[PDB]
Design an enzyme around this catalytic site. Structure first.
Site, short mmCIF file in Angstrom:
data_model
loop_
_atom_site.label_atom_id
_atom_site.label_comp_id
_atom_site.label_asym_id
_atom_site.label_seq_id
_atom_site.Cartn_x
_atom_site.Cartn_y
_atom_site.Cartn_z
N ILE A 22 0.88 -1.21 0.00
CA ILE A 22 0.00 0.00 0.00
C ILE A 22 0.90 1.24 0.00
O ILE A 22 0.67 2.13 -0.84
CB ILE A 22 -0.98 0.01 1.20
CG1 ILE A 22 -2.11 -1.02 1.02
CG2 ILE A 22 -1.55 1.40 1.45
CD1 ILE A 22 -2.85 -1.33 2.30
N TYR A 27 8.17 5.01 9.52
CA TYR A 27 7.49 3.99 10.39
C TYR A 27 7.85 2.54 10.02
O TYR A 27 8.10 1.72 10.96
CB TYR A 27 5.97 4.17 10.33
CG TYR A 27 5.27 3.93 9.01
CD1 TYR A 27 5.24 4.93 8.04
CD2 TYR A 27 4.60 2.74 8.74
CE1 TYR A 27 4.56 4.75 6.84
CE2 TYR A 27 3.94 2.53 7.53
CZ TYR A 27 3.92 3.55 6.58
OH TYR A 27 3.27 3.42 5.38
N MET A 29 6.35 -0.25 6.59
CA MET A 29 5.62 -0.51 5.32
C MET A 29 4.19 -0.90 5.69
O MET A 29 4.01 -1.63 6.67
CB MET A 29 6.28 -1.66 4.55
CG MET A 29 6.24 -1.49 3.02
SD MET A 29 6.95 -2.88 2.05
CE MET A 29 5.64 -4.07 2.33
N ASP A 140 -1.00 15.46 15.81
CA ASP A 140 -0.47 15.38 14.44
C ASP A 140 -1.60 15.16 13.44
O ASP A 140 -1.36 14.48 12.42
CB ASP A 140 0.61 14.32 14.31
CG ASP A 140 1.46 14.49 13.07
OD1 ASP A 140 1.68 15.65 12.64
OD2 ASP A 140 1.89 13.45 12.52
#
Ligand SMILES: COC[C@@]1(C(=O)Nc2ccc3[nH]nc(-c4ccnc(C5CC5)c4)c3c2)CCN(CC(=O)N2CC=C(c3ccc(-c4ncccn4)cc3)CC2)C1
EC number: 2.7.11.24
Length: 326
Positions: A22, A27, A29, A140
């Protein structure tokens, strides 16, 4: 043995199979996968944070918060995969609901309608109600952190920066944070503004340019805003600054809806003490056709300071994911 996506071990089988890239980011995958057990489509994302404490910190917030929250407009965690011993845990695999896309990609392809904008905003503030009702800041909020399914259902994700409230990306950063819970509303405002123009409203290059953009559109602060700041060095900065006149919203946003610009204003107020709270933003006229406090839940159990060595975090992380193991 294990599945593999773009040269990345995805060791989530045998339950999770048919994996499909995706996206990716610092972070890890994220992938679409089939849950062969519940027979349904999911999203698995591989995180590998155990080297540096701040990664461990974000991993544990993400997990702690999302496990504890259940809301219709918040991405939950469904399942979590990790090695059965703490020595051998190099990676965490966090399984969540699969969605079609985020608001970031959506804006890059289509100019939305007042219909699309009124609903998306409604769902955001709905999500935010639950979050704040738990004495928790997202910190955030931005387009790429609002996920969408083909049904125009919106869910908020990434609590890597989440905190408990305790008064003791730049373009959506509230002005008080360049100086020294309302900080979420300012993000929600900057998001509303982007959804209006298909443009980020306050796109600063650096922390000073960010202010100039902000004051460029609000004009210089009033007497009482300047007072409610109590930072002196910060406040001294603001004074040193050439006078700038308030742009009326309707000159930046000509073809936009009268009622929304009234909500944006109360959202993007410089003075954090004066700025509209979620509860009320919900009760604003622009969301009259959606606002339903019956159908607008609040956290049953409101909430935790962790600036600790990456060894104790790894323990807590292992501890919090334990519930997914035999
Ligand atoms: C923006 O949403 C992206 C993060 C988010 O949750 N994605 C996410 C979650 C659930 C999802 N369901 N469906 C989709 C999906 C489906 C279809 N099309 C899309 C869009 C086209 C992209 C999305 C989807 C996307 C990805 C992970 N993140 C939160 C997160 O996991 N935590 C907070 C940050 C952490 C972390 C960050 C960096 C590092 C690190 N950095 C450098 C070196 C080493 N480690 C380690 C941990 C770990 C824990 C927010």
């Amino acid at each position: 043995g294990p599945e593999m996506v773009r040269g990345q071990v995805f060791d989530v089988g045998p339950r999770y199979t048919n994996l499909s890239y995706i996206g990716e980011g610092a972070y890890g995958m994220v992938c679409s996968a089939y849950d062969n057990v519940n027979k349904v489509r999911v999203a698995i994302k591989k995180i590998s944070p155990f080297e540096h404490q701040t990664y461990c910190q974000r991993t544990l917030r993400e997990i702690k918060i999302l496990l504890r929250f259940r809301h219709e407009n918040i991405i939950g965690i469904n399942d979590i995969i990790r090695a059965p011993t703490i020595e051998q845990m190099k990676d965490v695999y966090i399984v969540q609901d699969l969605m079609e896309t985020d608001l970031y990609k959506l804006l890059k392809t289509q100019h939305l309608s007042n219909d699309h904008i009124c609903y998306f905003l409604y769902q955001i503030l709905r999500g935010l109600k639950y979050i704040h009702s738990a004495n928790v800041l997202h910190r955030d909020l931005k387009p790429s952190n609002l996920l969408l399914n083909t049904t125009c259902d919106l869910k908020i994700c990434d609590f890597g920066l989440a905190r408990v409230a305790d008064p003791d990306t730049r373009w959506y950063r509230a002005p008080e944070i360049m100086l020294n819970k309302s900080i979420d509303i300012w993000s929600v405002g900057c998001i509303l503004a982007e959804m209006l123009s298909n443009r980020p409203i306050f796109p600063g290059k650096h922390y000073l340019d960010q202010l100039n953009h902000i004051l460029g559109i609000l004009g210089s602060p009033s007497q009482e805003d300047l007072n409610c700041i109590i930072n002196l060095k910060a406040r001294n900065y603001l004074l040193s600054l050439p006078h700038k006149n308030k742009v009326p919203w309707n000159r930046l946003f000509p073809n936009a809806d009268s009622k929304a610009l009234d909500l944006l204003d109360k959202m993007l107020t410089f003075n954090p003490h004066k700025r509209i709270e979620v509860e009320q933003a919900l009760a604003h006229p622009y969301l009259e056709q959606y606002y339903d406090p019956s159908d607008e839940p609040i956290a049953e159990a409101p909430f935790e300071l962790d600036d600790l060595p990456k060894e104790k975090l790894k323990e807590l992380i292992f501890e919090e994911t334990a519930r997914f193991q035999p």
